[PDB]
Design an enzyme around this catalytic site. Structure first.
Site, PDB file in Angstrom:
ATOM      1  N   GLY A  92       0.767  -1.229   0.000  1.00 26.87           N
ATOM      2  CA  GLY A  92       0.000   0.000   0.000  1.00 26.87           C
ATOM      3  C   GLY A  92       0.804   1.289   0.000  1.00 26.87           C
ATOM      4  O   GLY A  92       0.311   2.311   0.475  1.00 26.87           O
ATOM      5  N   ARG A 112     -15.160 -15.060 -11.159  1.00 28.16           N
ATOM      6  CA  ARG A 112     -14.677 -13.682 -11.204  1.00 28.16           C
ATOM      7  C   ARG A 112     -15.821 -12.662 -11.185  1.00 28.16           C
ATOM      8  O   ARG A 112     -15.729 -11.622 -10.529  1.00 28.16           O
ATOM      9  CB  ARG A 112     -13.807 -13.477 -12.451  1.00 28.16           C
ATOM     10  CG  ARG A 112     -13.002 -12.180 -12.457  1.00 28.16           C
ATOM     11  CD  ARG A 112     -11.997 -12.146 -13.615  1.00 28.16           C
ATOM     12  NE  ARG A 112     -11.151 -13.340 -13.663  1.00 28.16           N
ATOM     13  CZ  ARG A 112     -10.000 -13.484 -13.009  1.00 28.16           C
ATOM     14  NH1 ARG A 112      -9.527 -12.507 -12.242  1.00 28.16           N
ATOM     15  NH2 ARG A 112      -9.314 -14.614 -13.123  1.00 28.16           N
ATOM     16  N   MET A 148      -3.910  -6.880  -7.486  1.00 24.10           N
ATOM     17  CA  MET A 148      -3.357  -7.847  -8.427  1.00 24.10           C
ATOM     18  C   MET A 148      -4.375  -8.896  -8.856  1.00 24.10           C
ATOM     19  O   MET A 148      -4.131 -10.096  -8.738  1.00 24.10           O
ATOM     20  CB  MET A 148      -2.127  -8.526  -7.822  1.00 24.10           C
ATOM     21  CG  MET A 148      -1.009  -7.559  -7.449  1.00 24.10           C
ATOM     22  SD  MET A 148      -0.354  -6.635  -8.859  1.00 24.10           S
ATOM     23  CE  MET A 148       0.730  -7.855  -9.603  1.00 24.10           C
ATOM     24  N   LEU A 181      -9.969  -7.865 -13.658  1.00 23.39           N
ATOM     25  CA  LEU A 181     -11.385  -7.566 -13.477  1.00 23.39           C
ATOM     26  C   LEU A 181     -12.217  -8.041 -14.657  1.00 23.39           C
ATOM     27  O   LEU A 181     -11.765  -7.997 -15.802  1.00 23.39           O
ATOM     28  CB  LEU A 181     -11.586  -6.070 -13.272  1.00 23.39           C
ATOM     29  CG  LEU A 181     -10.915  -5.517 -12.018  1.00 23.39           C
ATOM     30  CD1 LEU A 181     -10.797  -4.010 -12.121  1.00 23.39           C
ATOM     31  CD2 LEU A 181     -11.717  -5.920 -10.795  1.00 23.39           C
ATOM     32  N   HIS A 186       0.767   0.895 -13.231  1.00 24.51           N
ATOM     33  CA  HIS A 186       1.499  -0.251 -13.748  1.00 24.51           C
ATOM     34  C   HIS A 186       2.977   0.112 -13.818  1.00 24.51           C
ATOM     35  O   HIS A 186       3.318   1.178 -14.325  1.00 24.51           O
ATOM     36  CB  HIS A 186       0.976  -0.647 -15.124  1.00 24.51           C
ATOM     37  CG  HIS A 186       1.677  -1.832 -15.706  1.00 24.51           C
ATOM     38  ND1 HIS A 186       1.366  -3.125 -15.347  1.00 24.51           N
ATOM     39  CD2 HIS A 186       2.697  -1.919 -16.594  1.00 24.51           C
ATOM     40  CE1 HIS A 186       2.155  -3.962 -16.000  1.00 24.51           C
ATOM     41  NE2 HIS A 186       2.968  -3.256 -16.766  1.00 24.51           N
ATOM     42  N   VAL A 245      -6.158  -6.325 -20.548  1.00 25.29           N
ATOM     43  CA  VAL A 245      -5.282  -5.934 -19.439  1.00 25.29           C
ATOM     44  C   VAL A 245      -4.110  -5.057 -19.876  1.00 25.29           C
ATOM     45  O   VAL A 245      -3.403  -5.378 -20.832  1.00 25.29           O
ATOM     46  CB  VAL A 245      -4.745  -7.177 -18.702  1.00 25.29           C
ATOM     47  CG1 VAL A 245      -3.758  -6.779 -17.616  1.00 25.29           C
ATOM     48  CG2 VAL A 245      -5.898  -7.960 -18.102  1.00 25.29           C
ATOM     49  N   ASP A 246      -3.935  -3.937 -19.170  1.00 29.25           N
ATOM     50  CA  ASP A 246      -2.868  -2.971 -19.414  1.00 29.25           C
ATOM     51  C   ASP A 246      -2.921  -2.367 -20.815  1.00 29.25           C
ATOM     52  O   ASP A 246      -1.897  -1.930 -21.340  1.00 29.25           O
ATOM     53  CB  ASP A 246      -1.490  -3.615 -19.164  1.00 29.25           C
ATOM     54  CG  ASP A 246      -1.315  -4.068 -17.721  1.00 29.25           C
ATOM     55  OD1 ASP A 246      -2.024  -3.532 -16.833  1.00 29.25           O
ATOM     56  OD2 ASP A 246      -0.480  -4.964 -17.471  1.00 29.25           O
ATOM     57  N   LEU A 254       9.086   5.462  -6.474  1.00 29.17           N
ATOM     58  CA  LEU A 254       9.199   6.903  -6.232  1.00 29.17           C
ATOM     59  C   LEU A 254       8.441   7.689  -7.303  1.00 29.17           C
ATOM     60  O   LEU A 254       7.828   8.722  -7.016  1.00 29.17           O
ATOM     61  CB  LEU A 254      10.665   7.343  -6.209  1.00 29.17           C
ATOM     62  CG  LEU A 254      11.481   6.750  -5.059  1.00 29.17           C
ATOM     63  CD1 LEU A 254      12.923   7.227  -5.150  1.00 29.17           C
ATOM     64  CD2 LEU A 254      10.858   7.112  -3.721  1.00 29.17           C
ATOM     65  N   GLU A 275       5.950   6.310  -9.199  1.00 32.14           N
ATOM     66  CA  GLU A 275       4.545   5.920  -9.098  1.00 32.14           C
ATOM     67  C   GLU A 275       3.830   6.853  -8.135  1.00 32.14           C
ATOM     68  O   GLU A 275       2.690   7.270  -8.363  1.00 32.14           O
ATOM     69  CB  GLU A 275       4.404   4.482  -8.607  1.00 32.14           C
ATOM     70  CG  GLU A 275       4.941   3.423  -9.566  1.00 32.14           C
ATOM     71  CD  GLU A 275       4.742   2.016  -9.014  1.00 32.14           C
ATOM     72  OE1 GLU A 275       3.717   1.773  -8.344  1.00 32.14           O
ATOM     73  OE2 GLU A 275       5.620   1.159  -9.231  1.00 32.14           O
TER      74      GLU A 275
HETATM   75  N1  LIG Z   1      -9.794  -6.047 -17.105  1.00 32.37           N
HETATM   76  C1  LIG Z   1      -8.616  -5.514 -16.512  1.00 32.37           C
HETATM   77  N2  LIG Z   1      -8.225  -5.922 -15.300  1.00 32.37           N
HETATM   78  C2  LIG Z   1      -7.112  -5.427 -14.724  1.00 32.37           C
HETATM   79  N3  LIG Z   1      -6.501  -5.652 -13.543  1.00 32.37           N
HETATM   80  C3  LIG Z   1      -5.377  -4.935 -13.353  1.00 32.37           C
HETATM   81  C4  LIG Z   1      -4.431  -4.946 -12.169  1.00 32.37           C
HETATM   82  C5  LIG Z   1      -3.521  -6.169 -12.257  1.00 32.37           C
HETATM   83  C6  LIG Z   1      -2.653  -6.160 -13.514  1.00 32.37           C
HETATM   84  C7  LIG Z   1      -1.637  -7.299 -13.550  1.00 32.37           C
HETATM   85  C8  LIG Z   1      -2.127  -8.685 -13.203  1.00 32.37           C
HETATM   86  C9  LIG Z   1      -2.466  -9.602 -14.192  1.00 32.37           C
HETATM   87  C10 LIG Z   1      -2.937 -10.866 -13.832  1.00 32.37           C
HETATM   88  C11 LIG Z   1      -3.051 -11.195 -12.484  1.00 32.37           C
HETATM   89  C12 LIG Z   1      -3.604 -12.552 -12.009  1.00 32.37           C
HETATM   90  O1  LIG Z   1      -3.541 -13.560 -12.686  1.00 32.37           O
HETATM   91  N4  LIG Z   1      -4.249 -12.517 -10.737  1.00 32.37           N
HETATM   92  C13 LIG Z   1      -4.873 -13.623 -10.115  1.00 32.37           C
HETATM   93  C14 LIG Z   1      -4.839 -13.475  -8.611  1.00 32.37           C
HETATM   94  C15 LIG Z   1      -3.468 -13.750  -8.038  1.00 32.37           C
HETATM   95  C16 LIG Z   1      -3.620 -13.921  -6.540  1.00 32.37           C
HETATM   96  O2  LIG Z   1      -4.691 -13.568  -5.978  1.00 32.37           O
HETATM   97  O3  LIG Z   1      -2.684 -14.410  -5.854  1.00 32.37           O
HETATM   98  C17 LIG Z   1      -6.329 -13.581 -10.529  1.00 32.37           C
HETATM   99  O4  LIG Z   1      -6.753 -12.618 -11.228  1.00 32.37           O
HETATM  100  O5  LIG Z   1      -7.119 -14.495 -10.165  1.00 32.37           O
HETATM  101  C18 LIG Z   1      -2.727 -10.266 -11.506  1.00 32.37           C
HETATM  102  C19 LIG Z   1      -2.258  -9.015 -11.865  1.00 32.37           C
HETATM  103  C20 LIG Z   1      -5.321  -4.212 -14.524  1.00 32.37           C
HETATM  104  C21 LIG Z   1      -6.358  -4.464 -15.418  1.00 32.37           C
HETATM  105  C22 LIG Z   1      -6.794  -4.064 -16.673  1.00 32.37           C
HETATM  106  O6  LIG Z   1      -6.186  -3.234 -17.347  1.00 32.37           O
HETATM  107  N5  LIG Z   1      -7.913  -4.592 -17.191  1.00 32.37           N
HETATM  108  N1  LIG Z   2       0.446  -5.322 -12.584  1.00 31.41           N
HETATM  109  C1  LIG Z   2       0.262  -4.263 -11.615  1.00 31.41           C
HETATM  110  C2  LIG Z   2       1.480  -4.071 -10.746  1.00 31.41           C
HETATM  111  O1  LIG Z   2       2.508  -4.735 -10.882  1.00 31.41           O
HETATM  112  N2  LIG Z   2       1.338  -3.136  -9.814  1.00 31.41           N
HETATM  113  C3  LIG Z   2       2.445  -2.731  -8.982  1.00 31.41           C
HETATM  114  O2  LIG Z   2       2.400  -3.332  -7.694  1.00 31.41           O
HETATM  115  C4  LIG Z   2       3.082  -2.471  -6.762  1.00 31.41           C
HETATM  116  C5  LIG Z   2       2.199  -2.224  -5.555  1.00 31.41           C
HETATM  117  O3  LIG Z   2       2.954  -1.603  -4.523  1.00 31.41           O
HETATM  118  P1  LIG Z   2       2.194  -0.906  -3.278  1.00 31.41           P
HETATM  119  O4  LIG Z   2       1.306  -1.981  -2.679  1.00 31.41           O
HETATM  120  O5  LIG Z   2       3.337  -0.480  -2.379  1.00 31.41           O
HETATM  121  O6  LIG Z   2       1.388   0.205  -3.905  1.00 31.41           O
HETATM  122  C6  LIG Z   2       3.333  -1.157  -7.486  1.00 31.41           C
HETATM  123  O7  LIG Z   2       4.679  -1.161  -7.978  1.00 31.41           O
HETATM  124  C7  LIG Z   2       2.382  -1.247  -8.656  1.00 31.41           C
HETATM  125  O8  LIG Z   2       2.775  -0.455  -9.775  1.00 31.41           O
END
Ligand SMILES: Nc1nc2[nH]c(CCCCc3ccc(C(=O)N[C@@H](CCC(=O)O)C(=O)O)cc3)cc2c(=O)[nH]1
Ligand SMILES: NCC(=O)N[C@@H]1O[C@H](COP(=O)([O-])[O-])[C@@H](O)[C@H]1O
Length: 200
Positions: A11, A64, A89, A92, A108, A143-144, A171, A173
């Protein structure tokens, strides 16, 4: 504008957003913090700042869509306008993303479109870039891939590891996430009807 911050961990981005949104000229207020993980440090930070928290164990829903529905219920409860994903993480679901289209931001730790996904620093180091950075973007279904709001470049130093690189990139971010939230909350920047970023 009323903001929810979603987290999965430490956080530090949440703390930077707490700090920024409490400045007098902030157009955003953080009204709820939601974690998909219990007992993470981000929850302590929220509690310390007097912000309500909810933990939604994704490991308790059938799919989901149901999990996201549980998030959305809390968002409605707190009359939220804007959602910030701050180290959240999870991917959605489509309907959730579409409902919050133009109202949900993500941070990101790469310069998108490079190094999409959950391990951006590992990818940047494996690839051998000497410049990486971070990106705040609107969240789209892919995603992203959503519309970019702000970015900041960060150098990679010889011998960097995920530990030292992520530290340097955080820093940055902590600069651009608050700035991007203020741009959207003030109505300065919006997702355009043509899907592209609009500076109003
Ligand atoms: N639609 C949409 N959704 C989004 N989410 C985020 C933010 C995350 C981006 C990177 C990411 C990618 C995949 C995973 C993963 O596989 N996660 C496990 C749980 C892992 C666990 O709980 O331990 C899951 O989803 O079940 C985790 C992180 C950005 C973004 C976006 O741009 N569009
Ligand atoms: N795919 C998304 C991703 O990698 N997010 C990254 O997780 C960290 C969270 O740190 P924080 O809990 O200290 O904010 C941050 O570096 C964020 O950009």
């Amino acid at each position: 504008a009323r903001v929810a911050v979603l987290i999965s961990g430490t956080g530090s981005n949440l703390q930077a957003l707490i700090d920024s949104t409490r400045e007098p000229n902030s157009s955003a207020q953080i009204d709820i913090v939601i974690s998909n993980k219990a007992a993470v440090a981000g929850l302590d930070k929220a509690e310390r700042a007097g912000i309500p928290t909810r933990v939604i164990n994704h490991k308790l829903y059938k799919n989901r869509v149901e999990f996201d529905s549980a998030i959305d219920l809390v968002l409605e409860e707190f009359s939220i306008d804007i959602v910030c994903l701050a180290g959240f993480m999870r991917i959605l679901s489509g309907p959730f993303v579409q409902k919050w289209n133009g109202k949900m931001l993500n941070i990101h730790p790469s310069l998108l479109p490079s190094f999409k996904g959950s391990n951006a620093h590992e990818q940047a180091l494996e690839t051998g870039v000497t410049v990486t950075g971070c990106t705040v973007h609107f969240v789209a279904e892919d995603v992203d891939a959503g519309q970019i709001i702000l970015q900041e470049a960060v150098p990679v130093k010889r011998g960097d590891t995920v530990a030292t690189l992520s530290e340097r990139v955080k820093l940055a971010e902590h600069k651009i996430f608050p700035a991007a939230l203020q741009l959207v909350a003030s109505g300065t920047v919006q997702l355009g009807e043509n899907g592209k970023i609009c500076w109003v």
